[PDB]
Design a protein around this ligand. Structure first.
Ligand code: V2A
Ligand code: V2A
Ligand SMILES: *[C@@H]1O[C@H](CO)[C@@H](O[C@@H]2O[C@H](CO)[C@@H](O)[C@H](O)[C@H]2NC(C)=O)[C@H](O)[C@H]1NC(C)=O
Ligand SMILES: *[C@@H]1O[C@H](CO)[C@@H](O[C@@H]2O[C@H](CO)[C@@H](O)[C@H](O)[C@H]2NC(C)=O)[C@H](O)[C@H]1NC(C)=O
Ligand code: NAG
Ligand code: NAG
Ligand code: NAG
Ligand code: NAG
Ligand code: NAG
Ligand code: NAG
Lengths: 589, 136
């Protein structure tokens, strides 16, 4: 009657009237979009180890008592969209070890009469889109010692008083995050947040007028937030104007991480407002910021994150304690401009359609401790230096960016400590054997989607001894020069699939003593030299499918016998051309 | 042959190419230090052609590994930066060119660089030098 997925059964939208063709061992049951109407008792007694129960949109109007008997392992219960409204006492009897309760849109009216006081294991409580009018954190929250997140979004909370937050003032050891979004808050009582500590406080889409917001943020005074999230939504009520003075109240709040989301009105001054000077992590997302200049040098930001914004110019940054810079998914296109960030160790400038002319050396960044450079998914990156000043670099990513002039010198000569390089799909045509000189520590080389001069794999890996991962797929390779793999004694994965190889040579694989995975599928091979795989003493997986193998005897004898004895290693099925017969099945006379 | 100098970290010399021996005197003040150098190139010769469209073909090998052929334009033919772009065929050229480079890591060993000067209007070779750099 249902749909067996795995242990996992999917009974969604099956017009069912009640939950019995399911094994007792089942650990996940999705029963949503069924007109169940009543949850009768004893019902789930035969599901001893059920973990995930989804009862969304089941038209349930009544939860009987002990209706959840036998569920001594259920950790996730989801009752979204059920008009049950009145939860009887003992409504959640039996639900031990449950840690995630989703009661969205259940016509719930208050937390004080929510019979969850005995779910000691509970960690997350989502009661969004209900009728809750009060912000009161109820008394029984003291038994819920594992509760760390409460979602009160999309309710009717208008006021925050000192007695609403009484539970946290009494218990400063409690680690709690509150989601207040889409609540029409217009008044916070004086001192209501004094002596109050929260991990994450989300206040998105609450305010319609500038002055009600300024008044309410003033009465945040005394709050300690690890992360404060402010903003609005495009499809909701917005501030007609957003003056930086609206955030005056934040000077009495101690904030570790500040996060600004979309605001209909925005000025670049908002991000440089002085109450943000001592924030340690600053973050913008969906913000219509156009320029980021003149950030006061005494700002103590250690990380800065700019996602899906609208920067017209690459920011000029002098923040002397900034350790991590992220600028990603920027709208339009920008050209890189030099920076001077002497504490910078993490730089992510990916997915910006960014152009970089002068990559790369110390003078571009002003740091000696950069370890992570992500320039992937960008525009043209014109190489002109070989990373002098940047020798601590361990992770370098150019994926899907147009590298230029990288094959015209040893552009990575200083990167003696580099472990991860990705030049895949960078439109590079390699015609210089010394392109990878200096990369003596490299473990991972991903260079898929490129090409080689004369479609020939040249001796470019002579001094990358510590390679363990080498992806050469989709490089249009037609042949391989002698000795190219002689040094790769530690290589564990070699992907040469999706090329145009017509022949192999035994000598290329005679010294891959550490090789575990070898991908030769989707080429043009019709045979292999006898004994080509005989020294791959570490081989675990090999791909040979989508090749036009010639199964005439005695030509295919070695391969057919090798594929049969090592049938556990082959992934996919190498097939004979013409007949489609698997090669492992051929027995030569 | 033609000229040699050794700096703190480099031995630099050149000669004319085997296929082209047109004379030209090129020197360096100071001797190029590959760690980084500021100075002047002294050029003194009578060109076999007009320099209005002077460019170079550079064929570089580093530790016997061939780099792709390069082409570098000195005189574009309109409002050029150097006075010698005005020189005609047969006219004396004596000039000092300021140069400066730093911040690049040069591999140890020896390089070869043959520089071939072309007059872009005629595509005729004006001279050809065979530099030999030793980095210690
Ligand atoms: C290592 C040796 C000393 C042998 O050779 C060089 O150092 C060469 C040759 C210099 C030279 C000329 C005439 C006579 C002698 C030497 N100089 C560069 O490769 C270079 C110069 C300035 C740049 N800004 C870039 C940027 C990368 C670039 C790469 C390819 C390209 O086509 C354009 C730029 C490179
Ligand atoms: C611009 C002028 C002419 C003033 O000065 C230069 O040209 C100098 C060398 C001058 C010289 C001439 C003759 C003899 C000795 C030295 N060079 C560069 O500026 C340069 C810049 C970016 C690069 N990216 C490379 C790359 C080198 C390189 C090439 C291959 C390789 O495998 C490793 C490194 C060089
Ligand atoms: C307070 O609880 C929050 C969870 O709500 C903790 O924050 C998480 O921290 C872990 C790593 O420790 C991350 O993997 C999660 O993604 C974080 N979640 C959120 C929502 O930020 C926080 O560490 C706790 N504070 C303590 C233990 O002092
Ligand atoms: C070798 O490289 C190919 C292509 O570069 C990898 O192919 C992908 O395989 C996964 C799993 O089957 C698919 O979901 C992707 O769609 C494939 N990509 C393409 C472009 O076909 C293959 O996984 C690699 N083999 C390894 C790493 O062992
Ligand atoms: C649960 O909390 C109530 C009031 O907060 C308390 O009276 C009761 O003893 C607690 N349950 C225990 C400790 O089992
Ligand atoms: C937005 O503010 C206006 C008055 O400026 C008010 O009429 C309206 O109720 C507010 N929005 C909501 C969702 O209440
Ligand atoms: C930030 O820290 C400094 C130094 O501790 C302090 O003087 C200042 O009042 C703090 N708050 C700001 C600048 O808003
Ligand atoms: C690789 O580096 C070693 C280190 O001694 C060197 O001997 C060898 O010549 C290099 N390979 C080349 C330049 O092809
Ligand atoms: C440059 O000189 C070397 C020997 O120093 C020689 O082998 C080479 O053929 C010469 N190249 C040209 C273009 O003259
Ligand atoms: C070339 O110019 C230099 C610099 O002024 C000068 O010392 C030298 O004598 C000149 N050579 C000739 C032949 O005029």
């Amino acid at each position: 009657p249902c749909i067996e997925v795995v242990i996992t059964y999917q009974c969604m939208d099956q017009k069912l009237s009640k939950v019995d063709d399911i094994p007792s061992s089942t650990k996940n049951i999705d029963l949503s979009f069924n007109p169940l109407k009543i949850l009768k008792s004893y019902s789930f007694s035969n599901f001893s180890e059920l973990q995930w129960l989804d009862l969304s949109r089941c038209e349930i109007e009544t939860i009987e008592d002990k209706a959840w008997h036998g569920l001594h392992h259920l950790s996730n219960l989801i009752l979204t969209g059920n008009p049950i409204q009145s939860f009887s006492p003992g409504s959640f009897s039996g639900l031990t070890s449950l840690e995630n309760l989703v009661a969205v849109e259940t016509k719930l009216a208050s937390l004080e009469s929510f019979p969850i006081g005995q779910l000691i294991t509970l960690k997350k409580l989502n009661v969004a889109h209900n009728f809750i009018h009060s912000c009161k954190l109820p008394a029984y929250f003291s038994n819920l010692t594992n509760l760390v997140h409460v979602d009160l979004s999309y309710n009717y909370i208008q006021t925050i008083t000192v007695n609403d937050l009484q539970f946290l003032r009494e218990n400063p050891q409690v680690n709690l995050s509150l989601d207040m979004s889409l609540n029409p808050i217009d008044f916070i009582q004086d001192q209501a947040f004094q002596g109050i500590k929260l991990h994450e406080l989300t206040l998105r889409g609450n305010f319609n007028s500038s002055n009600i917001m300024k008044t309410c943020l003033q009465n945040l005074a005394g709050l300690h937030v690890h992360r404060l999230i402010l903003g609005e939504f495009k499809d909701e009520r917005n501030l007609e104007i957003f003056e930086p003075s609206i955030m005056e109240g934040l000077c009495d709040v101690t904030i570790d991480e500040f996060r600004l989301t979309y605001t209909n009105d925005f000025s670049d001054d908002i991000v440089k407002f002085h109450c943000l000077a001592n924030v340690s992590a600053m973050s913008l997302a969906g913000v219509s910021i156009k320029y980021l200049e003149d950030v006061p040098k005494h700002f103590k930001w250690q990380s800065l994150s700019i996602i899906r914004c609208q920067l017209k110019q690459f920011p000029t940054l002098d923040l002397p304690f900034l350790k991590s810079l992220t600028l990603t998914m920027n709208k339009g296109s920008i050209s890189f401009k030099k920076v001077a960030l002497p504490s910078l160790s993490y730089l992510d400038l990916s997915r910006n359609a960014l152009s970089f002319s002068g990559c790369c050396s110390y003078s571009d960044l002003g740091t000696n401790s950069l370890r992570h450079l992500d320039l992937s998914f960008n525009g043209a990156i014109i190489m002109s230096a070989n990373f002098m000043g940047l020798e601590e670099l361990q992770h370098l990513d150019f994926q899907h960016s147009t590298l230029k002039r990288v094959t015209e010198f040893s552009a990575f000569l200083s990167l003696e400590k580099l472990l991860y390089l990705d030049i895949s799909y960078t439109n590079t045509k390699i015609d210089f054997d010394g392109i990878f000189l200096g990369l003596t520590s490299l473990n991972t080389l991903k260079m898929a989607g490129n090409s080689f001069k004369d479609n020939t794999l040249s001796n470019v890996f002579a001094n990358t001894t510590n390679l363990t991962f080498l992806d050469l797929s989709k490089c249009q390779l037609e042949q391989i020069s002698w000795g190219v793999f002689d040094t790769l004694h530690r290589l564990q994965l070699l992907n040469m699939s999706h090329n145009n190889l017509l022949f192999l040579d035994s000598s290329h694989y005679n010294q891959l003593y550490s090789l575990k995975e070898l991908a030769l599928d989707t080429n043009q091979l019709k045979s292999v030299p006898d004994g080509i795989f005989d020294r791959l003493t570490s081989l675990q997986k090999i791909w040979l499918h989508t090749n036009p193998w010639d199964c005439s005897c005695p030509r295919i004898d070695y391969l057919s016998r090798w594929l049969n004895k090592n049938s556990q290693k082959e992934q996919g099925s190498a097939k004979c051309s013409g007949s489609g017969k698997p090669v492992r099945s051929i027995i030569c006379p | 042959q033609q000229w040699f100098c050794n700096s703190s970290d480099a031995i630099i010399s050149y000669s004319y190419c085997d296929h082209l021996k047109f004379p030209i005197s090129i020197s360096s003040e100071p001797c190029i230090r590959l760690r980084g150098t500021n100075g002047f190139v002294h050029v003194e010769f009578i060109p076999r052609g007009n320099l209005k469209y002077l460019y170079f073909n550079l064929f570089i090998s580093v530790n016997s590994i061939e780099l792709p052929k390069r082409k570098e334009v000195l005189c574009h033919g309109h409002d050029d930066d150097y006075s010698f772009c005005r020189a005609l065929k047969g006219e004396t050229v004596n000039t000092s060119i300021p140069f400066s480079f730093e911040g690049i890591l040069f591999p140890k060993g020896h390089y070869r660089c043959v520089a071939e000067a072309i007059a872009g209007d005629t595509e005729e070779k004006l001279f050809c030098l065979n530099f030999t750099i030793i980095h210690r």
